């Protein structure tokens, strides 16, 4: 891995992970945002919060992290600790417990063209106003609003992640299905600002129907 070592040393010489990578002054950074739902942990009605386990899927380009593979033993990609590189400060704005960030920063996959893909895990408690009128024969509309906390739309431009569908990805085989909730719809949308400090959002919606057998029996 001595070629990898030399490449890493060259990559991070003069690199500042706090500076947003804009090729020129005034350029935006496109950040594609997607979501994978590993588990719908619960929907607490008393606290009015949806607990989920997810993997984010963030993609962007950092021009500073590009190299010619021919000059570095054909190395086409690298796996780098996420703290080493600039990250878009994408957080769950509508969290209910004060926790904005991901569960583990893991590592980012960087291609030789500077493309960065980051898929951190996250356990999120999001605020969800409960439509209590038809409980327990009810359906809920719980949203996960993701956005940069600091950068405005002129600095970081958000897009929905699709290679591709505008939806929360659920793997059929490995998904931990909830015994009290059935997922009816799971779309994702890009919300533009209404129209200098304005910010986009990527909202992942979960429309879920309760399965009321317990209350019928009891």
């Amino acid at each position: 891995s001595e070629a990898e070592g030399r490449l890493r040393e060259k990559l991070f010489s003069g690199y500042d992970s706090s500076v947003r990578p804009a090729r020129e002054v005034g350029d935006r950074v496109r950040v594609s945002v997607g979501l994978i739902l590993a588990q719908l942990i619960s929907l607490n009605e008393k606290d009015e919060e949806m607990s989920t386990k997810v993997y984010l899927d963030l993609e962007w380009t950092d021009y500073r992290l590009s190299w010619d593979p021919a000059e570095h033993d054909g190395i086409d990609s690298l796996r780098i600790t996420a703290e080493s590189v600039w990250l878009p400060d994408v957080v769950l704005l509508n969290n209910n417990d004060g926790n904005f960030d991901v569960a583990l920063d893991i590592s980012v996959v960087v291609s030789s063209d500077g493309s960065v893909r980051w898929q951190p895990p996250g356990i999120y408690r999001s605020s969800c106003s409960i439509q209590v009128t038809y409980f327990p024969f009810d359906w809920q509309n719980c949203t996960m609003v993701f956005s940069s906390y600091s950068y405005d739309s002129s600095e970081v431009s958000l897009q929905t992640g699709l290679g591709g569908h505008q939806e929360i990805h659920i793997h059929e085989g490995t998904f931990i299905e909830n015994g009290q909730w059935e997922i009816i719809h799971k779309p994702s949308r890009l919300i533009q600002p209404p129209g200098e400090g304005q910010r986009q959002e990527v909202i992942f919606y979960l429309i879920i129907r309760r399965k009321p057998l317990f209350y019928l029996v009891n």
Epitope: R23, R30, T61, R64, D113, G114
Partner: antibody
Framework: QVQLQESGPRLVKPSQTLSLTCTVS??????????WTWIRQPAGKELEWIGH???????NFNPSLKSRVSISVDTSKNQFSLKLTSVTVADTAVYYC????????????????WGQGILVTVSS | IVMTQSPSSLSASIGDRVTITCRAS??????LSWFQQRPGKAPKLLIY???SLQSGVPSRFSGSGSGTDYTLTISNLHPEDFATYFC?????????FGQGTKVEIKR
């Protein structure tokens, strides 16, 4: 891996708008440190760099053709297009769409891959 | 930037060596590429960064130079190596191609 395909009318009349579209397969037009480039070669003469567009949407153009040239990117179709307004007979040429790769560590910039080329003739 | 590619035309035979120079008006930090165009075909990249050989190119093609002076060398010519050779610079915009040196069979 990535393939570029030019398309557009093969014949345009003078003083009109020449429009071309390059479709990119095996690669996103908004991902990676790339410049999506338009070049032309009139038959039997030098190659001329028309312009390029960066993934962020910023464009750069040849000063000779700066007023008449526009370049755009459509992310949904993975395409980028060129428009040249008020074309004369001198704008007849083989037009190429290319991808300029740029790397910071090795400090290099080079065109790879090129398109096949589309011959556009200006004639009423 | 103005790129002066010398000579405008050359004649060589199968097995001989070819040398093509492409001087630059301004200093270039090896942001130079050598392309080969056959009649009726798109330009084909041979060398980039003034020394790197493109994948799938025969090793006989060689690029060298720095600053303002750059050279392409074709030792042990082949029947398929009779084409037009262009030098392109990428140090600053607009990108400037060379005039184009054509090498054909010497009879």
């Amino acid at each position: 891996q990535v393939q570029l395909q030019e398309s557009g009318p093969r014949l345009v009349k003078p003083s009109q708008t020449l429009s071309l579209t390059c479709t990119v397969s095996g690669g996103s037009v908004t991902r990676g440190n790339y410049y999506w480039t338009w070049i032309r070669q009139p038959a039997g003469k030098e190659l001329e760099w028309i312009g390029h567009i960066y993934i962020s949407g910023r464009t750069n153009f040849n000063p000779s053709l700066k007023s008449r040239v526009s370049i755009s990117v459509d992310t949904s179709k993975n395409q980028f297009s060129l428009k040249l307004t008020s074309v004369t007979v001198a704008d007849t040429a083989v037009y190429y769409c290319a991808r300029e790769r740029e790397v910071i560590v090795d400090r290099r910039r080079w065109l790879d891959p090129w398109g096949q080329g589309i011959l556009v003739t200006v004639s009423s | 930037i103005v790129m002066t590619q010398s000579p405008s035309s050359l004649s060589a035979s199968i097995g001989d060596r070819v040398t093509i120079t492409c001087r630059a008006s301004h200093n270039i930090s090896r942001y130079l590429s050598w392309f080969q165009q056959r009649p009726g075909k798109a330009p084909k990249l041979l060398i980039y960064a003034a020394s790197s050989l493109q994948s799938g190119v025969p090793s006989r093609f060689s690029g060298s130079g720095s600053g303002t002076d750059y050279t392409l060398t074709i030792s042990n010519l082949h029947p398929e190596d009779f084409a037009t050779y262009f030098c392109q610079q990428s140090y600053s915009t607009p990108l400037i191609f060379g005039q184009g040196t054509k090498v054909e069979i010497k009879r």
